[PDB]
Each structure stands twice: as structure tokens, then as C-alpha cells.
RNA sequence: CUACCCAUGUCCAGGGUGAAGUUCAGGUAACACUGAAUGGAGGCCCGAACCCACGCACGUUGAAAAGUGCGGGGAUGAGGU
RNA sequence: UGAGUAGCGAAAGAGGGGUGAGAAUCCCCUCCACCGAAUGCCUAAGGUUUCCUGAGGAAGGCUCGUCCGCUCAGGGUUAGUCGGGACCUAAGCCGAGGCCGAAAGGCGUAGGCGAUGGACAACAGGUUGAUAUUCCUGUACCACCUCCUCACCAUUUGAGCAAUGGGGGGACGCAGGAGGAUAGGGUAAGCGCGGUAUUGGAUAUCCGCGUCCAAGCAGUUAGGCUGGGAAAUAGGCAAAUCCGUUUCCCAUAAGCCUGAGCUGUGAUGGCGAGCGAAAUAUAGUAGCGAAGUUCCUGAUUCCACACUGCCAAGAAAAGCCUCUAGCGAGGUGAGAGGUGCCCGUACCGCAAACCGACACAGGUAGGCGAGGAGAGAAUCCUAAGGUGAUCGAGAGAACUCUCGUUAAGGAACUCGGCAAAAUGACCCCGUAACUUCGGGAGAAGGGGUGCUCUGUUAGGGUGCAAGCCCGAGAGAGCCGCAGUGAAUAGGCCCAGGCGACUGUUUAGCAAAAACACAGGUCUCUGCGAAGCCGUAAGGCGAAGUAUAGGGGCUGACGCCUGCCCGGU
């Protein structure tokens, strides 16, 4: 702690992952309370693919509703971190 | 014309927020009322 | 002097300043400033304790020896300058030391006269010694009581002090207003009237100047209500109605001595007060 | 919100009136004094943004729990924000 | 119940097609119309997804409704340089110790917080159905550190670091006006269009455009400095080669510090009028892209609170430059090469997303804010842009409101010229009583203005000329009822009462003869203060000192302010 892996959650399947994802810059939901330098942490570690660089979003949630019962959605973190040219990719595969 | 709601942030968080009322033993009263009652939102 | 100004419009129908022929220069000495904040006043509770002051102008404070601790060596008057904290002007002098202090500015001076500080200094007009050297019927300001204090007595435009005759303790003073206080012997003063006389000539004139100052206006007895000042009330313009006339205290202010009569003043007054 | 204060910023389209002060020509013995040009100070004058709230009409279970339409006062200051 | 009644919340749409079961209210196109110193954009206060797409449509939409700021389902905000924190401080607040007080606490030192301030490194394009001085493409810049390379010192007879220590500097008001330059706008050169079917125009005819950074170099309008050097110091807690004080030398500017902007750079880049292919999960974009200059006008910006003047005399600490104390053995410099965090970034921000119970003719900082006429942000009409304001149809009555005409008479109406009508812009003539000598006074009362020509007038600004602008003044002549033909621009003039005046007040009936006001006074107060708020401590008064504060009375100016101390 703190670790490489549970820094990182997922990567975002969006319309924006189609065309990032060929650029050399991948989506990752982090944890809410870790920064940027955590996050070459990850890539290194995890993947051994070298970070380019890092660039971290941060949402608030949608409060949504289901019936009478309206609440509020956990917030969201995500990073878009860019590799180097040649260095592969570890994805779904 | 002008209303009493001009909205602030900071005044409305520094007149009527938490640690003002932890600040002082009446202001604290206020936060045993609240809590004696059992309200969900504490001291706005 | 004291220039008129032509009635251009009715602000100026009365209205003077005066000539500004005692100063020098303008921009002054950046390392004695210290910064001040019109108080409005108020109070350390919050509340508003002096009745209609508040509005002024930015004031800027210069430091003052009112005491002229330093001896012997004798000073030079570089420049005789202005300060909005009070009626009299304040003469730069630079010290043989280098220590440039703004000092208090007696009438007839200008550029360039040698002022000592010591109790063998002169009776030019500048120079400072303690009141046993001064001989008996010189114009001194600048009095203090306490030894070393400060001057706190005597300090503002045109005005002025004498000494009657003493003893080893105390020195007699006619101050001004006619109060002989048996000043200390010890107490350092210095010699001379104070500079910039015809402050009081001054027709003030359009009404904001006294804004300018500035002093928020009064409102008077029989105006307010009945409630928040003891005179106000009638059908409007009532006469002044109860007897002993009274402050928005319940005081009356026709000659209500207001000295504590068990005080310690009872022993220091030959002569009070002419009236 | 509003009354007052304190600290710090900010706003005031345009054009007029012309003083103090100066310079020059004249003037006395020096002053005084007088006229030209220069000069732009002023809770000055006009008038818009702005602020106010005197008329009138309307509206009055209103578009509005205080406004709207024509007009109006202040508009470099004791100013508005 | 009233009652299918009041109301449907200012403000032009119309026509074709499409969607769908259904269309005036939905979409697209084309005509027309409104704001255009705002109804435009950009970004705060706030709001918390209202943003985009794909479906629905019961409910909220003051009516429908395929539509929405409604419902669902996904998607949506990228920062070392932008705002804010790893910087500092203002009023204020909190406050170890401390001081007062039955308690709780009140105040307050050292300290620290707290921008609306000070300091501060990035820019021009592209880009999507959604983010941008963030992604990306080119340049840069800022600080720190060295696995590296070189350059130069010195080895405590010492390179350098040099401070929370001392200085300096940051560092400041308002008014006015030159200059100088840029934004911005408009002709002549050019380059792509084009020759028009309604008379005439291959014709000085028409349409459109005409560019561009931050950093770098180089000098510059111009501004300061008070001049610069040497020498000595009763000072600056302690120190000082720093600053201040004093004595000489040189003073026509040598020397410094700062600059708006110009210029090749930045760029053999990337926009640019327009050509808009393939058809593509038919956005129709990609792609292709000529000239791209001179001239004139020009600030409400900058140089710059710099200059001059005026008084009412105009924030503080660090960033930054120095000088010691103390470190100190390997350091300074250059290039290569690394590191660079947290939050904020969507969207509305004069609105239908905020404050108004409402998608309510109201209220909401600041920065951009064009053309013709014009002084101007006036006012009108238009470009840039945005908007059709979400019940309409069709009669043309009573009556209400909003307006516009009214013959003849004009205040007879009325408490009252309430109200309307009227006057108004420049230039010129001319202008009284009265006065405090400034005014009054835009007093009053009058005349001129449209166009053509003489005439690239006279003469100025600018330019070398060419060329533009800016133009009085006049003579001839034209036409109209009308010449500031429209819109916005004062109605005056006597005589009175009150109040000197500009101002302020009863937010939401009364702006006034009320209050303020300068001036006048009477009085108290010698400073641990008179009065204050305090139970007191503390603080105002005040880094004030009887030419100053507090209290009362009266209210510019002029003439004055007569009599009674019995009462109280």
C-alpha cells in the first residue's frame, strides 16, 4: 500500500475509447483520493508500458431517482494517460 | 426588486455552518437540538 | 497666508484654504510612513462610542518625536511638510546621525537652521531642554508631564505656553487657556510657537470639506424623537423644553463640571480656567 | 434585504461656462493697476449609460405582496456600484 | 356555486415539403420582420446537470403537440503557464501564555487565517454529436535536480551560499491636456467572381476578400534619477565596503533604470474569397485554395498617476537588488537530460438553467461593445451575431386602455392649465431690472440652413509627389406648402410667502416650508481626559492635545441680537 493495482479499477468502454485508444492514450477510472503521480505508478507497474503522460478528470454524480427514492450517484475519477511511441498495449485481448 | 436570498456560498457557510456553531457553547446548543431531535441535515 | 477664492459657483461663497507657502515638497519620506485606519468612532465591541466622525479621507501617518530624546547633536531642517492627522505642519530634519526624524514644526524656521536637543541647547527657536534651564517668560510648546513621556500637553497650530517663575520643583506654567500647572522640572519641551498660525482664519465654506475631513453631521435636540434625545418632541419646533438643557445623556451641558472633583489635579492648579 | 461603518477594487458617453495661477504688452519709483493670450478649478451648466422616485395615466382576485408607459431631478461627487 | 365565465403573462409571421396515426405550434428550406451601448459574446455571483445523442410522451408546459430546460437509456468537463491552494498581507476574525469577570465567557500579546489587492512562466491555428489561451501541430517560457559534457575560480592567507538580520524597492489620491503607438473603421493598387433580360450600363459596371501571433534579437518614441565619482561617519538592537548625514571633484550629459509600439524574425508555417469529390452508418465534410500591399481616419486602451496643477496629501508583507552574522570544500556558469502536484474546467449567466411560490413585462457584477448621418454609448436604420417569444381564428359593435387627427373659438372646464398641445440642433445678431459683481442668461426677441455649379474652392491635417481626408465663407441658379423637412434633443416672463445653496428622509401614500449644511455662538475638557460602550479588563476620543475634541442653541450673506437674576 499503496499499490499499483488497486489505484486503477477499469478501463471505460465509451464512443470516446474508440478513438483515443488508437492514439496511444487509454481511459482508466481511478480511486477518488489518488493523484497523478499514482497513476504512472499503475502503467509502469501493472502494464510495462512507459507514461507518456497523465491527465486526470474528476465528475460528480448524477443524482438519479427510482421511484419516490431519489439519491445521489458515487463520483467519479477518471485519467486519460498517454504511452510512449513503441510500447504496446495489454487490454482485453 | 431585490430579495432577501442573495445566494453565497461563503456567507451562507460561515454565518450559519458547522464549525461556527461548534464554535461557541450557545452555538452548540444548536447542534444538541439538532442532534436531540434527530434531524438529517445538521446546521446548514 | 490665507488666499479667498472667487464666487465661481455657491460652494465657493465663503470658502478658504490657505496658501500653502510653509511647505516644500510633496512626496515624503517613505521609511518613516505608518499606516493608519480610519476607526469611524467605533469601538473594540463594534459599537459606534463617538457621535459623527467617520467619512474621511485616506490619512497616512509620519512619525513624530514628541519627545526629542536625542541631545547635543544638532539637527538641520531639510524640508517642512504636511500631514493630514493633524492642524500644524511637521519640519523634516536630518540629524548629524542620519537619523531622519519628522519633527514637530515652530513658527519661523525654514531650510537649513541648526536645531539641538540637549539641556545645553539654545533658546533658538527648535532647540529642546528641560525647564529648569529655561529662564523665566520664554514661548515653549510641546510640554509633556511625565519625565520623558512625550508631549502631550501643548502641540497644535498657533499656540503657545510661558513659564511664570519656579522652583527646583515644580516649574510653573501659564499654559495655554490660562491653566497654571505646576509642571515638572525635569520634563523635557522645546522653544517656540507653533507653526501654521492662521489655521483657525480658515472659512471652511461648501459643506462636504467638513466630509472631507471629514465629520458625519449632528442632528440637534428638538429633532429627534422623543424616544432618542431628551429634548426632541412638540408639534415640530417646539421650544427647548425642560429646564437644565441635556445631552443625549441625561447630563445638563451648560458649565456641568465634569472634573472629578476627588482627583489629582486639585494640588497642580495654581489658576483654572478664565473663562 | 436594508441603516451606518471599515478595507479594497471598479464605473461615470459627449459638449459647454470660464476663475485662481502664469506669460506677454502697457503701466508706477517699486508696487499697485489695466488689457491680450495662455490656463482648466468647480458639491459649476446641458445631457446619455447609471441611480433616484416628483407629475400623470395604467394596473389594482395585477405581467408584478410596489411595477409598467409617457414625462422628470442628480449625473466628478456629500456620488453610483 | 360563479362558469364553460375572467384569465391564457407585452413583442409578425407566411408559404411549400418532410416526419407521424394525428401538425398552425415539430423539423428543413425560402421570403419577411425585431434587438443591434441590446434580445450580440465571455465570465463572475449562483444553479447542480438543465449539455450532447437515441427513444418515448401519461404527467410540468397557462392550448395542442411527433417537441422541450419533461421523462427514460447511455454519453459528456483533460491544464507546470488560465482562476484558487504548495506566496504575502488589509478591515476583520481566531488566538499559547496574559488580563478581567458568580460560572459560561469578554479582550488581547507573540503567532496565524482571511482577496476584492501586491507578486506571478503560453502562444496562434486545427479539432468533435460535447472540452480548450488544456487534446493535437509548431514554437516557446518557468522553477528544481543531475546518471552526462564542457567553461571559470579557489582549497579556510576561502570559491561561493549568502538571512526569518539591516537597507532599498515594490508603494499607490484626484482633476486636465498635449504627444507617441496599437487596437478598430473606410478609399486607391491587387486577386478570385462576374456582365446581368425591367429603360439604359465591357462599362471609372457589380459581388466578395485583402492576413497573423506569445519568445527571441536589434535599436526606438518617450518617461524618469536629481545629477555621477571619491572621502569620512555619535545612526540604522549585533555587524557591515548597504542606506542615511557631511566635504571636495566632474556636471551643457556622460552613466543607470524603465518602457506603448516598429522590424526581420517566429513562418519554405496557416488562414483566406471560392471551388464544396467519392457518396458516408450520404455530416455532405475532407480535399484544393489566388491576391493578401499602400493610403486616410482613430479611442472610451496603452506608454502612464508619466507630466502639470490641486488640495481633502493619497494600504501593508513577501516575490526582487544589495550589505554584513553564520556557514563552506568543491562550487558558479553554460549546453544535453530528466521532474513538475491538488482543486476549478460541461451548460444558463439580462435568462425559460438565479433572486423573485411560476419558464412571472421586475432585480443581477465586470470585460468586449461595429457602419451611415452624427459631438456622443444620443436617436433612427442596418452588418457581426441572436431572435419569431410557445392559444389562436374572424368579425370590426357598446365600453376601457393605448395612440393619431380635428373645423371656429381658445382656459370659458377645473380647487388648480391636471393633462395634453407647445419650445427645442448648430451658426449669428441681440439680451433688461437686480446683484454677493461670478451672474441672471440657452435671459428676453429675432435671422440663416435642402440641392447644383463656381469647386481636386479659401485655408488647414497628412503625405516626396500622387493621393486622400477636414473644410469656413460667399456669388450665381434650382425646386418644393415646408429645407436641423424624419427620430431624439429647453416653453417662457412678471410678482409674491418659505428655505441660502448641490444633497438627505418617511424602503411599500407624505422629497416638503422637514433634516443636513458651512458660518455664528454658549459650555465642558490639561490629556490614565471631557463624554463614551463596557460588571470590569480593553478601546473609541487619538499614534489628536484648548487654532483640538465632546455637548447644546441657531442656521449662507447684510443690518442687528432691546429689557428682567424675582422664580427655577
Known amino acids: 500500500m499503496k499499490d499499483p493495482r488497486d489505484v486503477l479499477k477499469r478501463p471505460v468502454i465509451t464512443e470516446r475509447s474508440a478513438d483515443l485508444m488508437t492514439e496511444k492514450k487509454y481511459t482508466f477510472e481511478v480511486d477518488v483520493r489518488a493523484n497523478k503521480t499514482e497513476v504512472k505508478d499503475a502503467v509502469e507497474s501493472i502494464f510495462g508500458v512507459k507514461v507518456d503522460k497523465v491527465n486526470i478528470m474528476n465528475y460528480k454524480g448524477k443524482s438519479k431517482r427510482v421511484g419516490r427514492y431519489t439519491g445521489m450517484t458515487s463520483r467519479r475519477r477518471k485519467a486519460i494517460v498517454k504511452l510512449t511511441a513503441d510500447s504496446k498495449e495489454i487490454e482485453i485481448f | ?44 | 497666508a490665507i488666499k479667498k477664492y472667487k464666487p465661481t459657483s455657491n460652494g465657493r461663497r465663503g470658502m478658504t484654504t490657505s496658501d500653502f507657502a510653509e511647505i516644500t515638497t510633496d512626496k515624503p519620506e517613505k521609511s518613516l510612513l505608518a499606516p493608519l485606519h480610519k476607526k469611524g468612532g467605533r469601538n473594540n465591541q463594534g459599537k459606534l462610542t463617538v457621535r459623527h466622525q467617520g467619512g474621511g479621507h485616506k490619512r497616512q501617518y509620519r512619525v513624530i518625536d514628541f519627545k526629542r530624546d536625542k541631545d547635543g547633536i544638532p539637527g538641520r531642517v531639510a524640508t517642512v511638510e504636511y500631514d493630514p492627522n493633524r492642524s500644524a505642519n511637521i519640519a523634516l530634519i536630518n540629524y548629524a546621525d542620519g537619523e531622519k526624524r519628522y519633527i514637530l514644526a515652530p513658527k519661523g524656521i525654514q531650510v537649513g537652521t541648526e536645531i539641538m536637543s540637549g539641556p545645553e541647547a539654545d533658546i533658538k527657536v527648535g532647540n529642546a531642554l528641560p525647564l529648569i534651564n529655561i529662564p523665566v517668560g520664554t514661548v515653549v510648546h510641546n510640554i509633556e508631564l511625565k519625565p520623558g513621556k512625550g508631549g502631550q500637553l501643548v502641540r497644535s497650530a498657533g499656540t503657545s505656553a510661558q513659564v511664570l517663575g519656579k522652583e527646583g520643583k515644580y516649574v510653573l506654567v501659564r499654559l495655554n487657556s490660562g491653566e497654571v500647572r505646576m509642571i515638572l522640572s525635569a520634563c523635557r519641551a522645546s522653544i517656540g510657537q507653533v507653526g501654521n498660525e492662521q489655521h483657525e482664519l480658515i472659512n471652511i465654506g461648501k459643506a462636504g470639506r467638513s466630509r472631507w475631513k471629514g465629520i458625519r453631521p449632528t442632528v440637534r435636540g428638538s429633532v429627534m424623537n422623543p424616544n432618542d434625545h431628551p429634548h426632541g418632541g412638540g408639534e415640530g419646533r417646539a421650544p427647548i423644553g425642560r429646564k437644565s438643557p441635556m445631552s443625549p445623556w441625561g447630563k445638563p451641558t451648560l458649565g456641568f463640571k465634569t472634573r472629578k472633583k476627588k482627583n489629582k489635579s486639585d494640588k497642580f492648579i495654581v489658576r483654572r480656567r478664565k473663562n
Open chain 2, 1 to 44: 426588486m431585490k430579495r432577501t436570498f442573495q445566494p453565497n456560498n461563503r456567507k451562507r457557510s460561515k454565518v450559519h455552518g458547522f464549525r461556527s456553531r461548534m464554535s461557541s457553547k450557545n452555538g452548540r446548543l444548536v447542534l444538541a437540538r439538532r442532534r436531540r431531535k434527530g434531524r438529517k441535515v445538521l446546521s446548514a
